[PDB]
Amino acid sequence: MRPLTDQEMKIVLDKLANYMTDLKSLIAPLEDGDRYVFRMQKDRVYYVKLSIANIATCVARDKLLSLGTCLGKMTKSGKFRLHITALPILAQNARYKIWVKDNGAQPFLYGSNIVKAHVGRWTEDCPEHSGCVVYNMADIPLGFGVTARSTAEARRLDPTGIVCFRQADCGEYLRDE
Amino acid sequence: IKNKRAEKAARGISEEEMFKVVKTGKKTHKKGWKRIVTKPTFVGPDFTRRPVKYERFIRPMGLRYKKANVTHPTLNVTVQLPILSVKKNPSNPLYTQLGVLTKGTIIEVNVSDLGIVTASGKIAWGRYAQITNNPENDGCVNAVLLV
Amino acid sequence: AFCKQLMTLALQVPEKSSQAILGLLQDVVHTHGRKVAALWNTEERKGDGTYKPLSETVEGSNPFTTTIWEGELLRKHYCPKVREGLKAMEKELRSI
Amino acid sequence: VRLLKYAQSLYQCKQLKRAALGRMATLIKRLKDPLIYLDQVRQHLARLPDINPTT
Amino acid sequence: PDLQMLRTRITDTIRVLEDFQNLAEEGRSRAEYTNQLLKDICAYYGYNEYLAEKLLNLFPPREAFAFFEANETPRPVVIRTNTLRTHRRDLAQALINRGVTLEPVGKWSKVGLQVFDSKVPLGATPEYLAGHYILQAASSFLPVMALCPQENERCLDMAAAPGGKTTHMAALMKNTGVIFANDPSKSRAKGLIGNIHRLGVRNTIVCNYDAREFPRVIGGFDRVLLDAPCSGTGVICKDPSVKTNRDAKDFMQLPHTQKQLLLAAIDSCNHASKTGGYIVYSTCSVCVEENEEVVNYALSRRPNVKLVETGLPFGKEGFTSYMGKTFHPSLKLTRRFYPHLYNVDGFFVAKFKKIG
RNA sequence: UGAAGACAUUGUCAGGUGGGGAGUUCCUUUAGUCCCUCGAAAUUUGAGGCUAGAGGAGAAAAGUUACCACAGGGAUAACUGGCUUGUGGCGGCCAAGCGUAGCGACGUCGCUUUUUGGAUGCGGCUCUUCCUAUCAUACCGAAGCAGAAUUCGGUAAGCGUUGGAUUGUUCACCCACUAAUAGGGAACGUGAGCUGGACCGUCGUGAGACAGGUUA
RNA sequence: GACCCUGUUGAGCUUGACUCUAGUUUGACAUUGUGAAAAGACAUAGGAGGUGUAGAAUAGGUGGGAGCUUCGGCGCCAGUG
C-alpha cells in the first residue's frame, strides 16, 4: 500500500465533498484513539481504519487484494471515479437524496436513468448538477448519481423525463461474481 | 447413455427486456446504439451483468444455444452434450469473448456421460471439441471431440 | 439519539422536570412512532457497530445499536406522576 | 422461425428453410413403421363387423 | 444392465445382510453378500470401487442406502441474513411481500432462513443487491457458531474462498476487530471481495498467500477458522465428479496438506489471549482419513492444544476408533453432520484451545 | 521530599512488509540420476536440494487492446438481376472412378429422437388483365375402393372462388352458409381508384439541455 | 447501415532494478520483588477403566498358546471380523 499524496487526497476529497455534507466526521478520531485513513493499492483507494492498515502492512504488495472499503480508482488521466462499494459512506452522510418507487427502483438496478415517472420523493431546493443518493421506498440505499434539473424544473418536467444521471448502482455486485 | 439419463431424471429477464428498460430510462436514443450480434452464441448463467465494455452487444434468446452434438472418433459415436464455455473462435477475439459459435470453433464440452477413462484412472468431465459446421445456416451445433 | 439521551436525563433529573421530559418523549413517539419503535423492540436492534455514549456528534453516536432499558428504574421512581407518564409511553408504544 | 427472424441474408434464409423442411422429413422417415402398423389396423377396423353390446 | 432390477437386488441384499442368521443361503457368506452389494451400488450409483467401499465401511446398510439416496437428492435453498443490515423477521416479511416461499431453517440458528420456491430470482432481489442476505449453506453456518468471534478481536479465516463465513464472522463481531481473509487463488478472491463489499464489511484484509506461511507473515491471531480443502464427499450433490474421481493417491495427498494446515493454525493462534485462544477446524468430507485423523495428528504432535466442546446444537460424536487405529478418547467431543439424518451438507467440526 | 506502581515504559535476538530515505550497476515449469534432506502414510508419497532452458536506469512513468464515449480522416454508396422453388447439417462404413497418399455421389448408422394418445409487433376495400404452383366443376390412373362418403396422383385456367369470434394488425385454432368458399404478378413507385429532420453556437459531460441561430 | 485509421477518454492487462534502512508489525527473552488464593504440566504410590460395523458379547494392544482344570465349566475347533 502507500498513503495518498496531497494532490490525490485533494481530488478524492473534492469528489467526496461533491457527494457528502460533512467530512470531518469521516476523518474524526474515535473513542479508542483510532481514526480512519486513506490508502492506495494498485490505483484503488481504500477507506480503512489506521489500526487495520498498520496490521495489514505485513502483507506483500502483490498479495494485498483488498483493505477496508474500496472508495474508487484513480484513472490514468488522474481523476477519481467513485464506486458502489463507496455507496455506504454516501448513504451515511448524503447531501441530496432521491427516493424512487419500485417501478424505477428495479430499472435503476438494471442500470437505467431515473425518471419523473419513477421519483417518489425529492429533497427541496436541489441545484441542477448536484449529488443525490438514490434510495427506494424502504429507505434502502440503492445507488448514487448526479441529478439532471432542479427541483422546480423536475416538478414542471414531463413525467417521462430524465431527472437523474446514473453513475453507479448495486447491480455491479451481480457483475463481479 | 440415454437410459442412464432417463433413470437419473426418475431420481431473470433477458437482455432485450433489460435494454428496453434502459431505453425507458433514457430519453435520447443514439442512432444505431443497439448493436445486436446476429450470430449464434453461448452464455451460460441465466442472469448476469455485463461490463460496460460489452453492454452494447445484445445476444437474442432465439440465437442462444446451450447444447450441441459432439462426435467421438475413436469410439465412433455422436451424443448430445452440454456446452460449458466457448474457448476460442479463430475469427475474432470479440467473437470468442461474446461466445460466438462459428465454423471450426474450439469449445469445452461435458463428457461425463460418455465415461472416458484416462491414464491416471480419472473420469473425463470436460474436453475440447471443434465446431465443424455453420450454426448460422444450420439450426444446430455439430462438433468433433479432440480426443 | 435524542430519545436515548433524554431517557437517561429523565432518569437522572428531578421529579417535575422528569415528568415534563416523559411527556415530551411521549409526544415524540406519538408524532414519529415507526421511526423510533426499534429503540424499544430489541429484535430490531442494529448490529452495524456499537453504541458510543460519550460521543462528540449525533450521527457519530450510533443510536439504533442500543436499547432503552431505563424503564426498569423509572417505573420504580418515587413519583406517581412520572410512573403513570411512563405507563402512558408504553401504552402508546403498544398501540403503535 | 425465430432463427429466420434473426436471419441476415437470402442464403441464410434458404439454408434455414432447407434445414427446417429436411429436419421434419427426417422425423417422418423415423416414423416409417408406426404408419404401416396404423394403416394395417385401420384396414382391419374398417372391415370389422358391427356387434351391438346390449341387444 | 437393468438398473431397476439392480435396485431390487440391492434391496434384497440389504435385507439379507440385516437378517443373515435367520434368512441365509446354503453356503453363501457375508463376504460374498457384501461384495455383491458393493458391485451393485458401484454400478447403479456411479461410484468407483475405492470410494464406494470406503463409504460402505463408514455406514450400516440401511444408513448407507439412505446416505446415497440423499447424495443423489439435492439440498433445499437456504440463506443467511446480514445482522449488519437487517434482521430475519423483516427480511422474511419483505421477501414474502415480493413473492417467495421461506420459513426459518430451524431453532438452532437465529440468522438462517430456508427457501423452498421462488417467483423472483433470489440473487437479483433489491435486498440481495443491497446486501441483506447471502445464499450460503447451513453446513457453512455451523463452523462460525462453533467459533463465535467476540468484538474487538483478531480472526484468521485461513481459507475464505466463497466469503459467506467471513461475512458471518463480521456479522458476529459487529464490524469490529480485524479479519485476515486468505484465499490462494485470485479468481475466487475476486468473488470474495465482491461479497464483502456487497454485504458491507469494513474489517477485512484479503490476502492471496499459501495458507501455510501464516506464522511467518502475521502470527498471533486471537481466533482462527480453517475450512480445509478436502475430497468433497459431503457436497457430492453439487459436484458429481467426486463419485468416481477420488482414488488412493488422492486420499494420501489431501490429508497431508490438511495436516500441515492444522499445524499452521495451531502455531498461528496465541496461548495468552484475553478473550479467546480458539482454533476451529472444519472439513467438507465424511471420510475418516479426511476427518478426525488430522485431529489425532494435531493432538499427537502439539501437546499444548486441547480439544474442547463444540457448542453446536445437533450432530453425532466423533469416532474414537475405526478399522485398527485408535484415536484419543477426547475426540468424542467433535461432531459429524450427514445429509440422511439432518438435511445438511456433510461436515466435520473440531474446536481447540491453545495453552502453550 | 510526596504520588503512582510489579503493569507500563524500555532493551536485545528472530522474522513479515517496505510506492517513503541513503548507496551500486525469491519462488514456478521442463528432463535426468532414482543423488541428499524435510514432512507424511507404513510396505509409499509430497516439498525443497544438483545439473541447464524457460517467467516474473526502474516510482518518473511506459507498453498494449478487431472493446467503450467523444472528435476527426479514409474507402464504400444502393441493390439482385437466365436470381428463385421439395427433400437439414455433422462424423463413420461402402464407394465407379480420378490418382497411384488425397477428392469422391446414392444409400446406411449415430445426434436432433420417444416402452403406453400460441406465434406475429403497415393494414384494409373495389375493378381490369394475365399465370398455374388446381379449391370446386369435366375426364382419367391407383387404393379393402361392397354401397356411400372419400384419399393420392394425372390432363386440364373454360367457369366460379364467403361470413364470423379473437387480436394494435395478421396468421394459427375454433364456429357458420357454400360446389368450393386455391395461391400469385402487373416488375426498385407491388395495374387503376379509395381508406385508416440536420448543421452550427453556449453551457455542459460519469450526463444532456437551450422559445439559441440557420436550413433542405 | 456497415468497414479501416488517428487523437483524447473510459474499461482491462503487463512492466515499473538490487542492497541496507526510518516507519509499521509478529514471536521469544530480560529487569523483578515479597506473599496469599486458584489452574496446568512434571514425582511417585495406588484405584478405576474402553459400547463405530459385524461378531453371542464393552475386542486397550502385543507376546507366545493346544490344551485349561477349587476338576465343570471351558479352550481349540465353525463362524464374523
PDB file of N, CA, C and O (backbone and C1' of nucleotides) in Angstrom, chain G residues 39-70:
ATOM      1  P     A G  39      -7.786 -25.362  41.549  1.00  0.00           P
ATOM      2  O5'   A G  39      -7.337 -25.481  40.027  1.00  0.00           O
ATOM      3  C5'   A G  39      -8.221 -25.111  38.980  1.00  0.00           C
ATOM      4  C4'   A G  39      -7.466 -24.691  37.746  1.00  0.00           C
ATOM      5  C3'   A G  39      -6.445 -25.686  37.222  1.00  0.00           C
ATOM      6  O3'   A G  39      -7.021 -26.730  36.458  1.00  0.00           O
ATOM      7  C1'   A G  39      -5.466 -23.548  37.317  1.00  0.00           C
ATOM      8  P     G G  40      -6.424 -28.219  36.553  1.00  0.00           P
ATOM      9  O5'   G G  40      -5.151 -28.180  35.597  1.00  0.00           O
ATOM     10  C5'   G G  40      -5.275 -27.769  34.246  1.00  0.00           C
ATOM     11  C4'   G G  40      -3.931 -27.530  33.608  1.00  0.00           C
ATOM     12  C3'   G G  40      -2.936 -28.673  33.691  1.00  0.00           C
ATOM     13  O3'   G G  40      -3.185 -29.692  32.738  1.00  0.00           O
ATOM     14  C1'   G G  40      -1.853 -26.633  34.208  1.00  0.00           C
ATOM     15  P     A G  41      -2.823 -31.220  33.074  1.00  0.00           P
ATOM     16  O5'   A G  41      -1.245 -31.294  32.872  1.00  0.00           O
ATOM     17  C5'   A G  41      -0.657 -30.949  31.627  1.00  0.00           C
ATOM     18  C4'   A G  41       0.821 -30.683  31.768  1.00  0.00           C
ATOM     19  C3'   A G  41       1.630 -31.773  32.451  1.00  0.00           C
ATOM     20  O3'   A G  41       1.948 -32.850  31.589  1.00  0.00           O
ATOM     21  C1'   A G  41       2.216 -29.676  33.360  1.00  0.00           C
ATOM     22  P     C G  42       2.461 -34.241  32.203  1.00  0.00           P
ATOM     23  O5'   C G  42       4.019 -34.002  32.424  1.00  0.00           O
ATOM     24  C5'   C G  42       4.754 -34.802  33.334  1.00  0.00           C
ATOM     25  C4'   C G  42       5.901 -34.032  33.936  1.00  0.00           C
ATOM     26  C3'   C G  42       6.636 -34.727  35.069  1.00  0.00           C
ATOM     27  O3'   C G  42       7.592 -35.671  34.616  1.00  0.00           O
ATOM     28  C1'   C G  42       6.136 -32.517  35.714  1.00  0.00           C
ATOM     29  P     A G  43       7.922 -36.969  35.503  1.00  0.00           P
ATOM     30  O5'   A G  43       7.495 -36.546  36.977  1.00  0.00           O
ATOM     31  C5'   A G  43       8.472 -36.198  37.948  1.00  0.00           C
ATOM     32  C4'   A G  43       8.408 -37.129  39.129  1.00  0.00           C
ATOM     33  C3'   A G  43       7.483 -38.322  38.966  1.00  0.00           C
ATOM     34  O3'   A G  43       8.090 -39.375  38.236  1.00  0.00           O
ATOM     35  C1'   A G  43       7.126 -37.316  41.082  1.00  0.00           C
ATOM     36  P     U G  44       7.372 -40.806  38.116  1.00  0.00           P
ATOM     37  O5'   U G  44       7.770 -41.550  39.466  1.00  0.00           O
ATOM     38  C5'   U G  44       7.019 -42.660  39.926  1.00  0.00           C
ATOM     39  C4'   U G  44       6.852 -42.635  41.424  1.00  0.00           C
ATOM     40  C3'   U G  44       5.757 -43.533  41.974  1.00  0.00           C
ATOM     41  O3'   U G  44       6.191 -44.873  42.119  1.00  0.00           O
ATOM     42  C1'   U G  44       5.590 -41.386  42.956  1.00  0.00           C
ATOM     43  P     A G  45       5.263 -46.086  41.623  1.00  0.00           P
ATOM     44  O5'   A G  45       4.991 -46.914  42.953  1.00  0.00           O
ATOM     45  C5'   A G  45       5.211 -46.331  44.229  1.00  0.00           C
ATOM     46  C4'   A G  45       3.921 -46.178  44.991  1.00  0.00           C
ATOM     47  C3'   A G  45       2.718 -46.891  44.401  1.00  0.00           C
ATOM     48  O3'   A G  45       2.709 -48.277  44.689  1.00  0.00           O
ATOM     49  C1'   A G  45       2.104 -44.704  45.061  1.00  0.00           C
ATOM     50  P     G G  46       2.258 -49.329  43.563  1.00  0.00           P
ATOM     51  O5'   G G  46       0.807 -49.780  44.032  1.00  0.00           O
ATOM     52  C5'   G G  46      -0.341 -49.409  43.287  1.00  0.00           C
ATOM     53  C4'   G G  46      -1.399 -48.792  44.165  1.00  0.00           C
ATOM     54  C3'   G G  46      -2.802 -48.801  43.587  1.00  0.00           C
ATOM     55  O3'   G G  46      -3.457 -50.036  43.794  1.00  0.00           O
ATOM     56  C1'   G G  46      -2.301 -46.632  44.354  1.00  0.00           C
ATOM     57  P     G G  47      -3.906 -50.926  42.537  1.00  0.00           P
ATOM     58  O5'   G G  47      -5.458 -50.609  42.407  1.00  0.00           O
ATOM     59  C5'   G G  47      -6.244 -50.415  43.571  1.00  0.00           C
ATOM     60  C4'   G G  47      -7.343 -49.414  43.332  1.00  0.00           C
ATOM     61  C3'   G G  47      -8.050 -49.516  41.995  1.00  0.00           C
ATOM     62  O3'   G G  47      -8.999 -50.566  41.949  1.00  0.00           O
ATOM     63  C1'   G G  47      -7.544 -47.257  42.439  1.00  0.00           C
ATOM     64  P     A G  48      -8.986 -51.600  40.720  1.00  0.00           P
ATOM     65  O5'   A G  48      -9.905 -50.896  39.628  1.00  0.00           O
ATOM     66  C5'   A G  48     -11.187 -50.401  39.980  1.00  0.00           C
ATOM     67  C4'   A G  48     -11.601 -49.251  39.098  1.00  0.00           C
ATOM     68  C3'   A G  48     -11.599 -49.519  37.605  1.00  0.00           C
ATOM     69  O3'   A G  48     -12.750 -50.222  37.176  1.00  0.00           O
ATOM     70  C1'   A G  48     -10.589 -47.425  38.043  1.00  0.00           C
ATOM     71  P     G G  49     -12.622 -51.394  36.086  1.00  0.00           P
ATOM     72  O5'   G G  49     -13.653 -50.967  34.951  1.00  0.00           O
ATOM     73  C5'   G G  49     -13.262 -50.933  33.588  1.00  0.00           C
ATOM     74  C4'   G G  49     -12.970 -49.524  33.131  1.00  0.00           C
ATOM     75  C3'   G G  49     -12.584 -49.358  31.666  1.00  0.00           C
ATOM     76  O3'   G G  49     -13.701 -49.202  30.804  1.00  0.00           O
ATOM     77  C1'   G G  49     -11.112 -48.107  33.071  1.00  0.00           C
ATOM     78  P     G G  50     -14.914 -50.289  30.600  1.00  0.00           P
ATOM     79  O5'   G G  50     -15.768 -49.681  29.390  1.00  0.00           O
ATOM     80  C5'   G G  50     -15.417 -50.049  28.047  1.00  0.00           C
ATOM     81  C4'   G G  50     -14.854 -48.851  27.334  1.00  0.00           C
ATOM     82  C3'   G G  50     -14.638 -49.060  25.834  1.00  0.00           C
ATOM     83  O3'   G G  50     -14.814 -47.861  25.084  1.00  0.00           O
ATOM     84  C1'   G G  50     -12.555 -48.804  26.909  1.00  0.00           C
ATOM     85  P     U G  51     -16.268 -47.454  24.513  1.00  0.00           P
ATOM     86  O5'   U G  51     -16.380 -48.259  23.138  1.00  0.00           O
ATOM     87  C5'   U G  51     -16.488 -49.702  23.076  1.00  0.00           C
ATOM     88  C4'   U G  51     -17.905 -50.127  22.778  1.00  0.00           C
ATOM     89  C3'   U G  51     -18.630 -49.290  21.736  1.00  0.00           C
ATOM     90  O3'   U G  51     -18.479 -49.937  20.479  1.00  0.00           O
ATOM     91  C1'   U G  51     -20.042 -49.869  23.610  1.00  0.00           C
ATOM     92  P     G G  52     -17.434 -49.382  19.407  1.00  0.00           P
ATOM     93  O5'   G G  52     -18.351 -49.054  18.126  1.00  0.00           O
ATOM     94  C5'   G G  52     -19.326 -47.987  18.242  1.00  0.00           C
ATOM     95  C4'   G G  52     -19.526 -47.333  16.899  1.00  0.00           C
ATOM     96  C3'   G G  52     -20.005 -48.249  15.773  1.00  0.00           C
ATOM     97  O3'   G G  52     -21.421 -48.328  15.717  1.00  0.00           O
ATOM     98  C1'   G G  52     -18.107 -47.049  15.051  1.00  0.00           C
ATOM     99  P     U G  53     -22.142 -49.733  15.861  1.00  0.00           P
ATOM    100  O5'   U G  53     -21.724 -50.503  14.533  1.00  0.00           O
ATOM    101  C5'   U G  53     -21.974 -49.971  13.220  1.00  0.00           C
ATOM    102  C4'   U G  53     -21.471 -50.942  12.186  1.00  0.00           C
ATOM    103  C3'   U G  53     -21.740 -52.396  12.511  1.00  0.00           C
ATOM    104  O3'   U G  53     -23.054 -52.724  12.100  1.00  0.00           O
ATOM    105  C1'   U G  53     -19.525 -52.130  11.693  1.00  0.00           C
ATOM    106  P     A G  54     -24.018 -53.483  13.092  1.00  0.00           P
ATOM    107  O5'   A G  54     -23.392 -54.945  13.145  1.00  0.00           O
ATOM    108  C5'   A G  54     -23.824 -55.954  12.217  1.00  0.00           C
ATOM    109  C4'   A G  54     -22.714 -56.929  11.907  1.00  0.00           C
ATOM    110  C3'   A G  54     -22.464 -58.018  12.941  1.00  0.00           C
ATOM    111  O3'   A G  54     -23.379 -59.104  12.870  1.00  0.00           O
ATOM    112  C1'   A G  54     -20.401 -57.128  12.244  1.00  0.00           C
ATOM    113  P     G G  55     -23.954 -59.738  14.218  1.00  0.00           P
ATOM    114  O5'   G G  55     -22.750 -60.645  14.791  1.00  0.00           O
ATOM    115  C5'   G G  55     -22.045 -61.550  13.910  1.00  0.00           C
ATOM    116  C4'   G G  55     -20.683 -61.824  14.494  1.00  0.00           C
ATOM    117  C3'   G G  55     -20.659 -62.213  15.972  1.00  0.00           C
ATOM    118  O3'   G G  55     -20.943 -63.589  16.173  1.00  0.00           O
ATOM    119  C1'   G G  55     -19.087 -60.532  15.626  1.00  0.00           C
ATOM    120  P     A G  56     -22.381 -64.109  16.693  1.00  0.00           P
ATOM    121  O5'   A G  56     -22.889 -63.031  17.754  1.00  0.00           O
ATOM    122  C5'   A G  56     -24.272 -62.914  18.069  1.00  0.00           C
ATOM    123  C4'   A G  56     -24.529 -63.074  19.549  1.00  0.00           C
ATOM    124  C3'   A G  56     -23.934 -62.005  20.454  1.00  0.00           C
ATOM    125  O3'   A G  56     -24.770 -60.865  20.557  1.00  0.00           O
ATOM    126  C1'   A G  56     -23.487 -64.168  21.339  1.00  0.00           C
ATOM    127  P     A G  57     -24.279 -59.429  20.028  1.00  0.00           P
ATOM    128  O5'   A G  57     -23.403 -58.850  21.225  1.00  0.00           O
ATOM    129  C5'   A G  57     -23.898 -58.813  22.557  1.00  0.00           C
ATOM    130  C4'   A G  57     -22.768 -58.930  23.545  1.00  0.00           C
ATOM    131  C3'   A G  57     -21.605 -57.977  23.305  1.00  0.00           C
ATOM    132  O3'   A G  57     -21.801 -56.724  23.937  1.00  0.00           O
ATOM    133  C1'   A G  57     -20.787 -60.188  23.561  1.00  0.00           C
ATOM    134  P     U G  58     -22.335 -55.462  23.101  1.00  0.00           P
ATOM    135  O5'   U G  58     -21.106 -54.451  23.117  1.00  0.00           O
ATOM    136  C5'   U G  58     -20.701 -53.823  24.327  1.00  0.00           C
ATOM    137  C4'   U G  58     -19.228 -53.503  24.324  1.00  0.00           C
ATOM    138  C3'   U G  58     -18.302 -54.706  24.471  1.00  0.00           C
ATOM    139  O3'   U G  58     -17.091 -54.458  23.759  1.00  0.00           O
ATOM    140  C1'   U G  58     -17.972 -53.230  26.287  1.00  0.00           C
ATOM    141  P     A G  59     -16.782 -55.234  22.386  1.00  0.00           P
ATOM    142  O5'   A G  59     -15.192 -55.344  22.353  1.00  0.00           O
ATOM    143  C5'   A G  59     -14.456 -55.613  23.541  1.00  0.00           C
ATOM    144  C4'   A G  59     -13.040 -56.043  23.244  1.00  0.00           C
ATOM    145  C3'   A G  59     -12.080 -54.925  22.843  1.00  0.00           C
ATOM    146  O3'   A G  59     -10.773 -55.243  23.318  1.00  0.00           O
ATOM    147  C1'   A G  59     -12.208 -56.510  21.103  1.00  0.00           C
ATOM    148  P     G G  60     -10.445 -55.206  24.891  1.00  0.00           P
ATOM    149  O5'   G G  60      -8.854 -55.192  24.958  1.00  0.00           O
ATOM    150  C5'   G G  60      -8.089 -54.483  23.996  1.00  0.00           C
ATOM    151  C4'   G G  60      -8.140 -52.999  24.248  1.00  0.00           C
ATOM    152  C3'   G G  60      -7.545 -52.112  23.170  1.00  0.00           C
ATOM    153  O3'   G G  60      -8.413 -51.936  22.067  1.00  0.00           O
ATOM    154  C1'   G G  60      -6.833 -51.368  25.295  1.00  0.00           C
ATOM    155  P     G G  61      -8.061 -52.617  20.658  1.00  0.00           P
ATOM    156  O5'   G G  61      -6.472 -52.586  20.616  1.00  0.00           O
ATOM    157  C5'   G G  61      -5.732 -53.765  20.353  1.00  0.00           C
ATOM    158  C4'   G G  61      -4.263 -53.546  20.588  1.00  0.00           C
ATOM    159  C3'   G G  61      -3.379 -54.774  20.468  1.00  0.00           C
ATOM    160  O3'   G G  61      -3.054 -55.077  19.124  1.00  0.00           O
ATOM    161  C1'   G G  61      -2.816 -53.572  22.428  1.00  0.00           C
ATOM    162  P     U G  62      -2.880 -56.603  18.655  1.00  0.00           P
ATOM    163  O5'   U G  62      -1.432 -56.998  19.181  1.00  0.00           O
ATOM    164  C5'   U G  62      -0.279 -56.325  18.701  1.00  0.00           C
ATOM    165  C4'   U G  62       0.940 -56.678  19.512  1.00  0.00           C
ATOM    166  C3'   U G  62       1.240 -58.162  19.648  1.00  0.00           C
ATOM    167  O3'   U G  62       1.916 -58.692  18.523  1.00  0.00           O
ATOM    168  C1'   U G  62       1.398 -57.126  21.766  1.00  0.00           C
ATOM    169  P     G G  63       1.812 -60.258  18.179  1.00  0.00           P
ATOM    170  O5'   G G  63       2.563 -60.975  19.389  1.00  0.00           O
ATOM    171  C5'   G G  63       3.965 -60.830  19.562  1.00  0.00           C
ATOM    172  C4'   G G  63       4.459 -61.548  20.793  1.00  0.00           C
ATOM    173  C3'   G G  63       4.044 -63.001  20.936  1.00  0.00           C
ATOM    174  O3'   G G  63       4.813 -63.872  20.128  1.00  0.00           O
ATOM    175  C1'   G G  63       3.791 -61.895  23.011  1.00  0.00           C
ATOM    176  P     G G  64       4.120 -64.677  18.925  1.00  0.00           P
ATOM    177  O5'   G G  64       4.853 -66.090  18.939  1.00  0.00           O
ATOM    178  C5'   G G  64       4.207 -67.236  19.472  1.00  0.00           C
ATOM    179  C4'   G G  64       4.606 -67.481  20.905  1.00  0.00           C
ATOM    180  C3'   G G  64       3.877 -68.615  21.611  1.00  0.00           C
ATOM    181  O3'   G G  64       4.436 -69.889  21.328  1.00  0.00           O
ATOM    182  C1'   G G  64       3.866 -66.696  22.989  1.00  0.00           C
ATOM    183  P     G G  65       3.673 -70.923  20.359  1.00  0.00           P
ATOM    184  O5'   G G  65       2.406 -71.387  21.202  1.00  0.00           O
ATOM    185  C5'   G G  65       2.542 -72.239  22.330  1.00  0.00           C
ATOM    186  C4'   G G  65       1.225 -72.396  23.045  1.00  0.00           C
ATOM    187  C3'   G G  65       0.077 -72.924  22.195  1.00  0.00           C
ATOM    188  O3'   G G  65       0.064 -74.339  22.098  1.00  0.00           O
ATOM    189  C1'   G G  65      -0.627 -70.977  23.316  1.00  0.00           C
ATOM    190  P     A G  66       0.339 -75.058  20.687  1.00  0.00           P
ATOM    191  O5'   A G  66       0.543 -76.591  21.071  1.00  0.00           O
ATOM    192  C5'   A G  66      -0.436 -77.568  20.736  1.00  0.00           C
ATOM    193  C4'   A G  66      -1.390 -77.816  21.879  1.00  0.00           C
ATOM    194  C3'   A G  66      -2.527 -78.789  21.573  1.00  0.00           C
ATOM    195  O3'   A G  66      -2.890 -79.485  22.765  1.00  0.00           O
ATOM    196  C1'   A G  66      -3.427 -76.676  22.117  1.00  0.00           C
ATOM    197  P     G G  67      -2.081 -80.793  23.233  1.00  0.00           P
ATOM    198  O5'   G G  67      -1.574 -80.431  24.701  1.00  0.00           O
ATOM    199  C5'   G G  67      -2.477 -80.360  25.797  1.00  0.00           C
ATOM    200  C4'   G G  67      -2.955 -78.949  26.031  1.00  0.00           C
ATOM    201  C3'   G G  67      -3.665 -78.689  27.351  1.00  0.00           C
ATOM    202  O3'   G G  67      -2.770 -78.488  28.431  1.00  0.00           O
ATOM    203  C1'   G G  67      -4.924 -77.757  25.595  1.00  0.00           C
ATOM    204  P     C G  68      -3.278 -78.625  29.951  1.00  0.00           P
ATOM    205  O5'   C G  68      -4.261 -77.385  30.155  1.00  0.00           O
ATOM    206  C5'   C G  68      -3.771 -76.050  30.156  1.00  0.00           C
ATOM    207  C4'   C G  68      -4.795 -75.098  30.722  1.00  0.00           C
ATOM    208  C3'   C G  68      -5.271 -75.432  32.127  1.00  0.00           C
ATOM    209  O3'   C G  68      -4.429 -74.838  33.100  1.00  0.00           O
ATOM    210  C1'   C G  68      -7.139 -75.039  30.703  1.00  0.00           C
ATOM    211  P     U G  69      -4.532 -75.232  34.651  1.00  0.00           P
ATOM    212  O5'   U G  69      -5.901 -74.582  35.131  1.00  0.00           O
ATOM    213  C5'   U G  69      -6.518 -75.002  36.339  1.00  0.00           C
ATOM    214  C4'   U G  69      -7.948 -75.412  36.106  1.00  0.00           C
ATOM    215  C3'   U G  69      -8.590 -76.163  37.269  1.00  0.00           C
ATOM    216  O3'   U G  69      -9.989 -75.882  37.296  1.00  0.00           O
ATOM    217  C1'   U G  69      -8.603 -77.535  35.368  1.00  0.00           C
ATOM    218  P     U G  70     -10.694 -75.432  38.667  1.00  0.00           P
ATOM    219  O5'   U G  70     -10.438 -76.663  39.644  1.00  0.00           O
ATOM    220  C5'   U G  70      -9.788 -76.470  40.895  1.00  0.00           C
ATOM    221  C4'   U G  70     -10.736 -76.654  42.053  1.00  0.00           C
ATOM    222  C3'   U G  70     -12.131 -76.070  41.849  1.00  0.00           C
ATOM    223  O3'   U G  70     -13.088 -76.874  42.536  1.00  0.00           O
ATOM    224  C1'   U G  70     -11.090 -75.005  43.689  1.00  0.00           C
TER     225        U G  70
END
